[PDB]
Scaffold this active site. Sequence first.
Site, PDB file in Angstrom:
ATOM      1  N   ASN A 107      10.041  -7.864  -2.363  1.00 42.79           N
ATOM      2  CA  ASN A 107      10.327  -6.951  -3.468  1.00 42.79           C
ATOM      3  C   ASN A 107       8.989  -6.404  -4.021  1.00 42.79           C
ATOM      4  OD1 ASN A 107      10.940  -5.770  -6.038  1.00 42.79           O
ATOM      5  ND2 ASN A 107      12.937  -6.850  -5.964  1.00 42.79           N
ATOM      6  N   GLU A 146       2.518 -12.988  -2.286  1.00 43.91           N
ATOM      7  CA  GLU A 146       1.684 -11.801  -2.185  1.00 43.91           C
ATOM      8  C   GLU A 146       0.191 -12.114  -2.065  1.00 43.91           C
ATOM      9  OE1 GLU A 146       3.897 -12.394  -4.740  1.00 43.91           O
ATOM     10  OE2 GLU A 146       5.282 -10.684  -4.824  1.00 43.91           O
ATOM     11  N   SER A 157       6.048   6.170   5.859  1.00 40.50           N
ATOM     12  CA  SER A 157       4.851   6.703   6.505  1.00 40.50           C
ATOM     13  C   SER A 157       3.759   5.665   6.637  1.00 40.50           C
ATOM     14  CB  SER A 157       4.253   7.843   5.622  1.00 40.50           C
ATOM     15  OG  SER A 157       5.076   8.956   5.700  1.00 40.50           O
ATOM     16  N   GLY A 158       3.126   5.619   7.810  1.00 37.29           N
ATOM     17  CA  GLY A 158       2.029   4.690   8.028  1.00 37.29           C
ATOM     18  C   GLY A 158       2.460   3.301   8.496  1.00 37.29           C
ATOM     19  N   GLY A 174       7.829   7.625   2.473  1.00 43.22           N
ATOM     20  CA  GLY A 174       7.530   6.314   1.944  1.00 43.22           C
ATOM     21  C   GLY A 174       7.419   5.243   2.989  1.00 43.22           C
ATOM     22  N   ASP A 230      -2.709  10.949  14.295  1.00 38.38           N
ATOM     23  CA  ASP A 230      -2.368  10.502  12.923  1.00 38.38           C
ATOM     24  C   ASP A 230      -2.474   8.979  12.808  1.00 38.38           C
ATOM     25  OD1 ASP A 230      -1.481  10.444  10.311  1.00 38.38           O
ATOM     26  OD2 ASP A 230       0.622  10.852  10.783  1.00 38.38           O
ATOM     27  N   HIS A 282      -2.392  10.575   7.590  1.00 38.68           N
ATOM     28  CA  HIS A 282      -1.830  11.377   6.495  1.00 38.68           C
ATOM     29  C   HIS A 282      -1.616  10.540   5.226  1.00 38.68           C
ATOM     30  CE1 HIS A 282       2.388  10.214   7.789  1.00 38.68           C
ATOM     31  NE2 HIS A 282       2.609  10.364   6.490  1.00 38.68           N
TER      32      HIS A 282
HETATM   33  N1  LIG Z   1      12.136  10.956   9.666  1.00 38.97           N
HETATM   34  C1  LIG Z   1      10.768  10.854  10.137  1.00 38.97           C
HETATM   35  C2  LIG Z   1       9.757  10.983   9.011  1.00 38.97           C
HETATM   36  C3  LIG Z   1       9.194   9.827   8.485  1.00 38.97           C
HETATM   37  C4  LIG Z   1       8.243   9.834   7.484  1.00 38.97           C
HETATM   38  C5  LIG Z   1       7.856  11.048   6.983  1.00 38.97           C
HETATM   39  C6  LIG Z   1       8.401  12.232   7.499  1.00 38.97           C
HETATM   40  C7  LIG Z   1       9.361  12.208   8.503  1.00 38.97           C
HETATM   41 CA   LIG Z   2       6.438  -8.693  -4.684  1.00 41.18          CA
END
Ligand SMILES: NCc1ccccc1
Ligand SMILES: [Ca+2]
Length: 223
Positions: free
Chosen positions: A54, A62, A177-178, A175, A84, A40
């Site tokens: 940061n 980096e 996610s992944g 954020g 996913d 996703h």
């Molecule tokens: N709280 C779980 C979640 C994480 C990332 C995106 C949607 C839901």
């Molecule tokens: Ca940085």
Amino acid sequence: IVGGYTCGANTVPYQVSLNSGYHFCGGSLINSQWVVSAAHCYKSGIQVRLGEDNINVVEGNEQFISASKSIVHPSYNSNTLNNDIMLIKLKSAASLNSRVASISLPTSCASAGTQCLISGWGNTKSSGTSYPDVLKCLKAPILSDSSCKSAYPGQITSNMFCAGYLEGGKDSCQGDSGGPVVCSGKLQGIVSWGSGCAQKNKPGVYTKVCNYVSWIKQTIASN
Ligand SMILES: NCc1ccccc1
Ligand SMILES: [Ca+2]
């Protein structure tokens, strides 16, 4: 990450930020040339940012490397989030040292009750919005299959697991996610979906990486 803590700079050396002009997803470095993330999180024009703490300040550790190829799982269904997972190939190999390192793929699936480390630069509020600059972490247990199915009746496949806290207050969020779920030093999960963040009886749902190791290995051996 809601209800977590500041990881500590470069203590999660496999964590990556995916950047398309701004941070939008996490991922995990599994090889000097490959990142695993959520399907996703697919988009064109990804730059992989390794060695970050940061994400808004260049601190000196980096490595910014453009993606050369993205491979979404052949059976990814964006409606259910089954399968996913996505692989991202880097245009050049990352340089591996203390602050940038790969995470091992699992051999065996992780156990219910195991405490895992979830990390990311996602929202830190259950209600409202606040996005951190430094990497945040959360220790969270894998929940039983029956508990997970009670939280999301009809929606949990064998390629998913829940982790977190039914009482609410501690969870991954938008954020994150992944990004990685690491248990006993292996990548066992990918931050995938849920219903909001840190709400009662709605724990996070994670892609079950152990089910994809054969596909990952075959794909990296041919691309
Ligand atoms: N709280 C779980 C979640 C994480 C990332 C995106 C949607 C839901
Ligand atoms: Ca940085």
